[PDB]
Symmetry: C3
Subunit: 335 residues, 3 copies
Amino acid sequence: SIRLADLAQQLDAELHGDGDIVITGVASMQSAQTGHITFMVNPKYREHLGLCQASAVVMTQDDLPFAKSAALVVKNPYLTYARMAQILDTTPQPAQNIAPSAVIDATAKLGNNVSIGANAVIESGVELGDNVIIGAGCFVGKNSKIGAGSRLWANVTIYHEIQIGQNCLIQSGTVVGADGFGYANDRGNWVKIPQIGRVIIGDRVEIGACTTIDRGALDDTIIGNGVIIDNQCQIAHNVVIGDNTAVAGGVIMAGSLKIGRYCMIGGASVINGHMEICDKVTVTGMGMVMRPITEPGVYSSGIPLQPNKVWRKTAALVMNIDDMSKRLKSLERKV
Amino acid sequence: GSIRLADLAQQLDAELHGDGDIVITGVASMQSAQTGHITFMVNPKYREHLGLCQASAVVMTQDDLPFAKSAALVVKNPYLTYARMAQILDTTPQPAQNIAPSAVIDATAKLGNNVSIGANAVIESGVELGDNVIIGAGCFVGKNSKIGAGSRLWANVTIYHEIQIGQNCLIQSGTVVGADGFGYANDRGNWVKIPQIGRVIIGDRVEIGACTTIDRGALDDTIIGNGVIIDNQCQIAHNVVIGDNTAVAGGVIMAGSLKIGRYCMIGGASVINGHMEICDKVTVTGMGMVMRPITEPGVYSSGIPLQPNKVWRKTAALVMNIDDMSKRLKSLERKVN
Amino acid sequence: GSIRLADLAQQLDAELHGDGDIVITGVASMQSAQTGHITFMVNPKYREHLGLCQASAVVMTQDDLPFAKSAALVVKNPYLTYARMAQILDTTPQPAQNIAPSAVIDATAKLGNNVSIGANAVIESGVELGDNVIIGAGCFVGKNSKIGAGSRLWANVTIYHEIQIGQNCLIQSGTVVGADGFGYANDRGNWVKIPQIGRVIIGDRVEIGACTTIDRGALDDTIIGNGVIIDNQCQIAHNVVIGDNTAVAGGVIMAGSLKIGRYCMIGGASVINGHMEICDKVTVTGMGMVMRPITEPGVYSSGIPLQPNKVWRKTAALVMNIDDMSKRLKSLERKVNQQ
Ligand SMILES: Cc1cc(C)c2c(-n3cccc3)nn(CC(=O)NCCCN3CCOCC3)c2n1
Ligand SMILES: CC1(C)CC(=O)c2c(nc3nn(-c4ccccc4)c(O)c3c2-c2cccs2)C1
Ligand SMILES: CC1(C)CC(=O)c2c(nc3nn(-c4ccccc4)c(O)c3c2-c2cccs2)C1
Ligand SMILES: [Mg+2]
Ligand SMILES: [Mg+2]
């Protein structure tokens, strides 16, 4: 719980109303009750603000005349919402102290205030920085290093020789450092190429659940600082992702792709490897990326949904588009 | 467990034709069935083949009966009867039995009657497990989550905090329920985390396949209706709502704040945009690219399917240059007119 | 781990040019290699660059040898020799060693010789682990499953009940073998679960990537042939059959009752529908949408690639309206045919 005046100071917002109001939590506009702070970004909600029962609403200056409660005025209500949600966060920690059921190699190096959940398994040579939290059931493999403040939720798998920076967060079910998909061929028989590169994850990286980031073949798979990666993503061996890039859910990246900084990869895209994407590229959902991208901007692919009856005809005609092209050329030749 | 054919027929509401004292030990396919097995026929093309089936009994329709070469259970719907007799004769083990000494259970967790928790599972403070709940080995159930009576988690399932799961659900291994939604604000190119303090509410009789992820909501909740079935490796983003009885096939990716109605069927590997709605009674065929809201019931499809590579190269290049093709068509129309 | 260059050369059947007493400690890329490392060259464009490489030895071909600025191992196939030498010098640790005290092992489980079981792994009743099997930390192996000699599971792999895994397999973390297939009947609008009492049978020398799911069959079995390699995040549905030596790249989804032949190559993120067959020696390129059986060997492809968004908007609009284009073309043809 926090006083509205104090909250507004920490958010650098201008208070309009009783600064003695006690705020206990954040809520959506429709769910907010007495004691909740909420926010609005879309002007369509201005008109029924009198129906919102929050104790305070974060809004812009042009929103103030419509306010029907205490208001915090800011330039960017969505960013201010992020900040106040952090102040008022109710999310528990993955673990507290070291659990008696955790299995920790005696050669592990642990910083101060490290927490390790029940039945986690820490291999030899592992280094956990100050304030690192390892959730229940995790595995951290030989000689891996996790920087100060980083946290793994329950049932995360980190392989050997992995480096993770400071203040990272990895959601459950994710696997960092599995073998890349590397094989030679000896007369139709696959020959395993041991994958002895690593994964290097920078600072302030957030990785979702059931995502996989393979280790490099010789040199490393690299995730830059400030990168966010959603659930169900595959990052193949020797991918390099530049700082602050965002990868939405279900994206598949093939080996040796290089993505620049400040990119935004839409959900379920497929990005082929051994190529580069420059800084500040957006690929919309399900994008089929077959070629290098050398200019910033938004790129898209795919023929979207139609009623099945229409789709049958669309797909049949497209599959015969070479015959359509030949017919058009013949008609030109004749005319 | 073995059962007399007469008793099985009564529990299945089937008409017995043959020896009621035959002992049935299990269910098998028609081609694999051996003595002691019961099987079923749905395709009358196999009538002439029944003499090759070594099952002790065969489920079939009244129209099939004259072709039987075994004891027969006559029913209106052999497939549904098959589902029912396979449940009666199910050989699937339970994920756990009793409470394992290696399980780690907070003293404040509330266990109902006949709860089983497998080896090395971890149950946080405040968790409530209803009567007959089974938690498989190596699971994690986070603080204050609640799992309704008769629900079962296979091994290595992760439930975060404040999750609500209904009665008689079944969740396969590797599934993660309640991870943070993908919520971030952008500050001059840097991502600022938005804590995800909503929940997941899963209804009654929900089945979730392996390595599916259902994220918790940002403020309000991600909601899965009753009777929903979800296959493997689906992503259900924060604040998605899925209506009762909807089926989601394998590998479907949903963006945040999608609402799917009741009675929908979403084909495998489909991709669905967020912040929009799909109405009731919609079927999306496999690999559907769902970019826009769906406002009328019915069947919807997308995608240009496989061709020989040499052919595909021309299809792809021509489609990519279809604007030029369109302009050439228009120009030729003007010249001819 | 370390080995004299002469001994390494013999084991690789390579011709040594240089000092056989050099001690090799590991493999590295050309750019990262330092004293003690062996590396390899496959691209002759780097001949002029070998003077910048600080490896103790470089694997190359006879045609490369005049360009060497180091001890050289001459072979016919530097890439294959690289794979073999990386195995000889492999630094990958084992998933476990010995039987961990925190593992929970049913009294009826049967273990071969030199089995290792990692911390907090859980082994159900009736399980049989062959000689030299390694089960990683936190794994689950369900009732009556059998894992053949030499096979290894990394940490946090889930094997359900009645699963059979052959010899010398390797399964990466987060993978789930034997979950229920997606089987349900319909009772007046209510889903009715169909128990999935088939199994999964995995052959010898199968490698399966991370967070891959392979479901058990409904009555008969899901089958993975020998020598199959499967990447991360793949989904193999109930009753799929995959033939020997087929490769499946990452994020591939296969629907129920698909049969894939031998020596196939399925590109990443492909979607393969079920109740159909793909013959031997078929390559499906990445993101392929497979809706129909494939009866002839060769290379097959689908998908319309990326364009700038403003261009894609016009492409998509025109394609979605292609029936009108087809009608206009037919009408124009009739006019030109004087009809
Ligand atoms: C699942 C999904 C599915 C479809 C079909 C589409 C879509 N679409 C519109 C036309 C063609 C595709 N657009 N989008 C949204 C989208 O891709 N935005 C750009 C990337 C967002 N960044 C922000 C931070 O995280 C990383 C990702 C989608 N999403
Ligand atoms: C739930 C049910 C008993 C019936 C059903 O509707 C269904 C089932 N299994 C499926 N597998 N795949 C699939 C999986 C992977 C790749 C490609 C396709 C579908 O698309 C499936 C569908 C659907 C078809 C159209 C919409 S949902 C079993
Ligand atoms: C098994 C092997 C040694 C050789 C191989 O054939 C192969 C390999 N790695 C791949 N990654 N991706 C991929 C991954 C993610 C997104 C997009 C593409 C492919 O499609 C891959 C393929 C194939 C190409 C065509 C058919 S299979 C390594
Ligand atoms: Mg333990
Ligand atoms: Mg996918």
